[PDB]
Amino acid sequence: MTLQEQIMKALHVQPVIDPKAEIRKRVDFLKDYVKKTGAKGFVLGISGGQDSTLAGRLAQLAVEEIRNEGGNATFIAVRLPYKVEDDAQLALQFIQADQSVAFDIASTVDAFSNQYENLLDESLTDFNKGNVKARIRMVTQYAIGGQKGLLVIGTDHAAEAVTGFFTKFGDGGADLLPLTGLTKRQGRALLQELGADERLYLITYDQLDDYLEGKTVPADVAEKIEKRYTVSMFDDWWKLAAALEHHHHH
Amino acid sequence: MTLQEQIMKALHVQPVIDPKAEIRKRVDFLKDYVKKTGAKGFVLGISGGQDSTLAGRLAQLAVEEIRNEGGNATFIAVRLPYKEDDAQLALQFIQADQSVAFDIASTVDAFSNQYENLLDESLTDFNKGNVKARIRMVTQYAIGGQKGLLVIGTDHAAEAVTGFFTKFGDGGADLLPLTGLTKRQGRALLQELGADERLYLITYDQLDDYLEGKTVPADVAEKIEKRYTVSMFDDWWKLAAALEHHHHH
């Protein structure tokens, strides 16, 4: 297999998808995991980002279907601002979750930061604080999940990230990853099919997504992408490398 | 190959080990990871528990060797109390370059107070247990990120991956130096390292007998193999624990 074919197989990306069928398959994936684990539903942090907007809508459709089939399921969407968006609100209006919680993480993040800066006698850098915030957001989702018997839906470990590009803050841990196999642009296709407000979804992502979707791309573009894939979960390696690099050049 | 032999292989547990050889093997593992990642050392939460006590000493030995060989490495041990006799004894045995006392109470209570107010309910003991474990990991990763260090983990022990003696938290870490060792073998390494007896002294004996390739009663093997099949394996049990506690609450 060409390296491109190996990558696609490893990331489960398909060259051509059927949006309606993708939504069907992923809503089923969610419904099946609920049944297998005995969970009462899902919880997800809604940031206004494309991934959580799509994953959130899929979760709402899933619990509605479960209830329609005579089962018990609930979806709790949680907004996790640090002090202070309209994108998040717009996403919540699209998702229409059973419960929408506004949980400011500032008092927790600041208590940690204040303790850290006092005990270690140094200031937390923007990058490391970025990871603290991401982790505190996960603490919040897992606390809600644990208190309500829900599964935490994750949006990290996206195809592009595993490849080595566009890495996110945080460790990416979650109970389920319903968007596995989709590129950023394919996700855009699902959101369109779901009727989301276009504003919710409107090397580069296009070049990278062309490559991941098995399309033909310039030799140099392929070289750059395969170069990073070979240097390398692959995603975790890039998260650690980023932390080390920022510390080094700080 | 029996199921028992398959499980031993999958978990990398050896029927017989040589404490000195294991120590050298695991110290080399730590040193090699440092070189491959370009990190400046390690950070580890010291609880007073056997796993972190052993992993911490191996970390200190690793950085001393790296420095002795002309390299740069540092080991930072951190005590994370929530509002530590065994932890103090452990720190004394480990003799780390830096020992930090970081009380997590102000962070855990800030979260708890916010949670109870916004969701209008009390955090159960089990769920607060996970909150504390995660906050302890936030601290270690914040220290690691700020110092260019790797976070050493002690979760995903052989016994846990099999489905027994599950721990709080998600078990995420940068490196797992104790992979393959049973709790019993861990004690052996500690004695070889000269640790204070107070630091290392289905049941663990039945389970470790099985994982070590010893012949055990059919019913014992039956129970162990049953859980191993009902499933990361460890993560499944963490989730199951959270769901069961919520249910029986």
Side-chain angles (χ1 to χ4, degrees):
Chain A
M1 299 182 91
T2 65
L3 186 56
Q4 173 173 50
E5 300 171 312
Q6 311 187 317
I7 292 177
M8 292 183 65
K9 181 183 180 184
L11 306 181
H12 305 81
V13 182
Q14 303 188 304
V16 182
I17 60 161
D18 185 327
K20 294 188 189 62
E22 280 302 326
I23 292 166
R24 184 66 260 159
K25 178 186 63 177
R26 289 155 197 287
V27 167
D28 281 357
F29 167 74
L30 288 175
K31 292 170 59 177
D32 285 315
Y33 210 67
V34 148
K35 302 169 186 171
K36 291 297 178 180
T37 61
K40 300 286 182 186
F42 321 90
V43 57
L44 171 64
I46 301 311
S47 68
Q50 184 185 301
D51 297 340
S52 56
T53 294
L54 173 58
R57 186 51 185 167
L58 296 176
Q60 185 54 38
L61 292 170
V63 297
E64 288 176 348
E65 270 185 37
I66 292 181
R67 294 196 295 258
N68 289 343
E69 288 162 36
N72 306 293
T74 314
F75 173 49
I76 299 183
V78 56
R79 211 181 73 226
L80 305 157
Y82 173 63
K83 287 176 166 57
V84 172
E85 175 178 55
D86 182 54
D87 259 32
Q89 289 302 305
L90 190 57
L92 292 174
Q93 297 181 64
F94 164 65
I95 296 168
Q96 294 298 313
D98 296 335
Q99 291 180 42
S100 182
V101 184
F103 195 113
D104 197 316
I105 65 169
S107 70
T108 302
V109 169
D110 292 346
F112 177 77
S113 297
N114 287 174
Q115 184 74 318
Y116 183 97
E117 303 193 326
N118 265 319
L119 301 188
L120 275 89
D121 181 24
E122 70 179 14
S123 63
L124 279 180
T125 66
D126 291 343
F127 192 82
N128 295 318
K129 189 176 176 184
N131 276 321
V132 164
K133 291 190 281 189
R135 285 171 187 281
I136 292 305
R137 286 187 166 113
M138 286 317 106
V139 165
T140 306
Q141 294 175 58
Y142 271 99
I144 296 175
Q147 288 277 298
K148 306 298 297 185
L150 313 172
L151 301 171
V152 175
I153 291 178
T155 56
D156 208 341
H157 301 317
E160 295 84 350
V162 177
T163 297
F165 308 77
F166 308 104
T167 311
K168 297 182 176 178
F169 279 122
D171 62 26
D175 296 314
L176 277 188
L177 298 176
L179 304 186
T180 302
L182 291 172
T183 59
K184 181 69 62 170
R185 86 153 55 104
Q186 292 180 328
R188 200 172 318 169
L190 296 227
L191 284 175
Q192 288 188 59
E193 181 54 51
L194 291 170
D197 187 293
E198 53 182 356
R199 293 180 292 171
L200 284 173
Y201 57 76
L202 297 175
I203 63 175
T204 61
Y205 260 101
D206 280 314
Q207 300 178 300
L208 178 53
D209 282 356
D210 283 334
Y211 181 88
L212 296 179
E213 295 168 8
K215 290 175 167 53
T216 296
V217 295
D220 48 302
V221 171
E223 182 186 57
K224 298 181 181 182
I225 298 176
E226 313 190 78
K227 186 182 181 181
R228 302 207 60 179
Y229 186 76
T230 183
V231 174
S232 177
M233 175 57 95
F234 300 63
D235 185 23
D236 298 319
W237 177 270
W238 297 114
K239 285 171 178 297
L240 174 56
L244 291 171
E245 181 266 60
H246 279 267
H247 174 248
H248 181 64
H249 301 300
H250 182 64
Chain B
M1 177 160 80
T2 60
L3 186 59
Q4 169 178 38
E5 298 171 64
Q6 293 180 56
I7 295 179
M8 288 173 73
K9 179 176 186 174
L11 305 187
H12 301 86
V13 181
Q14 306 198 302
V16 181
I17 56 168
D18 165 47
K20 279 191 176 185
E22 279 304 318
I23 292 175
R24 159 50 55 203
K25 166 190 170 297
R26 290 157 192 291
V27 166
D28 289 332
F29 169 72
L30 286 171
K31 295 169 63 182
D32 290 323
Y33 212 76
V34 161
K35 328 304 188 61
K36 183 176 184 179
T37 63
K40 317 188 74 176
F42 315 101
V43 61
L44 173 64
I46 303 306
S47 70
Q50 181 184 306
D51 295 339
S52 59
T53 296
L54 169 55
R57 183 58 187 161
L58 298 176
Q60 186 53 37
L61 292 167
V63 295
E64 297 181 333
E65 291 199 3
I66 287 175
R67 292 197 294 262
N68 192 192
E69 286 160 35
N72 302 307
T74 315
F75 174 47
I76 302 187
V78 56
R79 200 163 61 71
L80 304 152
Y82 173 60
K83 285 178 166 53
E84 294 285 57
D85 246 301
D86 290 293
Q88 285 303 308
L89 193 61
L91 284 179
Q92 279 168 40
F93 161 66
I94 293 170
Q95 293 295 310
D97 298 322
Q98 294 178 44
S99 295
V100 180
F102 196 109
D103 197 314
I104 67 176
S106 67
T107 301
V108 167
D109 297 339
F111 175 78
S112 292
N113 289 338
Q114 183 79 319
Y115 181 97
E116 309 201 326
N117 269 316
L118 300 188
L119 287 134
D120 185 22
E121 52 171 40
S122 293
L123 273 176
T124 63
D125 292 338
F126 189 86
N127 293 147
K128 190 177 182 186
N130 277 318
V131 167
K132 290 195 275 67
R134 286 196 161 77
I135 292 302
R136 286 192 168 106
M137 294 314 298
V138 170
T139 309
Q140 293 172 68
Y141 271 101
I143 293 174
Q146 289 275 300
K147 307 297 296 189
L149 314 170
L150 302 174
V151 172
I152 287 175
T154 59
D155 212 334
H156 304 313
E159 293 85 353
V161 177
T162 299
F164 307 77
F165 315 102
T166 306
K167 294 181 172 181
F168 278 127
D170 55 49
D174 294 318
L175 200 58
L176 301 174
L178 308 185
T179 300
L181 293 177
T182 62
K183 272 283 185 176
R184 195 152 66 204
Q185 302 178 317
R187 279 190 175 190
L189 299 203
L190 281 178
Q191 180 174 58
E192 178 56 44
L193 292 165
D196 181 306
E197 291 62 54
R198 286 174 290 175
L199 292 171
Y200 63 75
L201 298 176
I202 297 298
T203 62
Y204 267 96
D205 277 295
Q206 295 183 298
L207 181 55
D208 285 0
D209 278 328
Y210 177 101
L211 292 171
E212 279 161 38
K214 308 187 199 312
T215 301
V216 303
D219 60 295
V220 171
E222 183 54 46
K223 299 184 180 181
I224 296 176
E225 307 175 326
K226 180 175 182 177
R227 276 196 177 178
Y228 183 80
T229 300
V230 183
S231 60
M232 178 62 86
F233 301 73
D234 189 26
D235 296 324
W236 167 268
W237 301 110
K238 286 174 182 295
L239 175 57
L243 293 170
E244 309 325 306
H245 280 267
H246 169 66
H247 182 63
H248 308 309
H249 179 71

